[PDB]
Amino acid sequence: EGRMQIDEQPGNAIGAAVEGFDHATASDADIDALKSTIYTKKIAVLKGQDLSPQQFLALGKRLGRPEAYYEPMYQHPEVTEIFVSSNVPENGKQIGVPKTGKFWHADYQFMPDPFGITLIYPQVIPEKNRGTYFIDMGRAYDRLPEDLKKEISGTYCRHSVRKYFKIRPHDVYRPISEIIEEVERKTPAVVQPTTFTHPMTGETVLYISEGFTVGIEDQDGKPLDEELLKRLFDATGQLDESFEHDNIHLQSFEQGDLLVWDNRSLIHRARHTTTPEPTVSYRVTVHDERKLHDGI
Template structure:
């Protein structure tokens, strides 16, 4: 395994000569420790079948299957498919995913630590994924905002960016909304928590699903605070020129792996989209997502 910093990038390293299926456990442990400090790993020269890809995810931890079947790979439900291509006249996966700043699964009671993306069909023009490191961004917040965010909680919900499914056509909107609330009710997570590996505070809010800040007792914090913090860290910058924003490019054979606790991300969509297909596998790692979450889940009977 050879590790090389990405030239001229705000974060991330390239990892070459890694055999995803045959690498010894010690090497995989080193790989996971590396992602927590470097944030993004670009595993070069990978040639994995869908089954191999899922197996690699299992070597890293517990693979999470996405809760909505319309995103599933037809043969391996553990793979989330983002695609604007049709196969045999049928849509496989979902187009135009991730068009907003988000952490994966932050709208669920038990988020996961690692996200893996394996591009399959890559546009020839502008391509990539945008990232913000919310460990670093939190440290750079004005002291006043850090003080207001300390010990706060965020309420997250998928309702803003829920994608209508083929089965929802002709259904009453009220019925769809009621199902969304029943299937994915809003969840409450600490808005700032210590990273289980680095120990540094992580700001855990996103433009996509965070809609309310509260104190520990559930009382709302001041109006405008959430918007002010999102703007300060770069999530409301529609020009994508904020100093915190990193554009991660990729090429055929790259497999991206990143720290889903500290990074928010969004897809780079262009006005004239080219064919694109990407496979995602998501993994619960060896660490509690944040201190106390397992106790919360147990108390809630989850």
């Protein structure tokens, strides 16, 4: 340690900026303070990071245990644990996958054991149409009308990647039904309580997203009408295509920034493709000292 400085946004405003962070030299107390900022301010922006892919993984390893993405076409060619979102060819070749995350989601919400912390290190940043949208789903839960809180009490949700699974090069010429069935086998839909208690803060989190949450079911396992999910998406801001809803936060960044966020509390989305500007980002996703929630 000696010079990491965390500047948290005041009051209830989301976010924090972190100056002087060096993952190779930060103390244990520095790391614990950064993690507390992540869980309470939700998004920590590390400033002035000039890191190789290997150094980025090393930074993630200070915060938790990295997990590689289960579909390897997303993986960086040198570092399996880095997920690459890219639409800039390198020597004419596609690296990673283009145009990822164009829907509201929490990362790995369709998997049984999601990690708690996402790290994004932007490489190529659109000049005009840059940033990622976020909604804090604990704050969104707290803002629901009381009767809507009651209606989801006791319920469970089903989450699946089936809508947004991306076709891979080796899928060409396969019948689509075989791919659909392979997705159901490899990544079956996962049931979770509709709300859970955040292990680090005690907040109640509404754990749903328009992109991955495919059904809601009662306290006894019987499917409820998806009109309930639509009303929850509506109330929490996930159906507002203008992105002006009060719950929505647009997180911008500049070169050298590195975003670290709470993947229990937040859902996120890419912006509309209103410009032809490219995006390249590297992502590391880490498990911290607790499961996503205590029922895992």
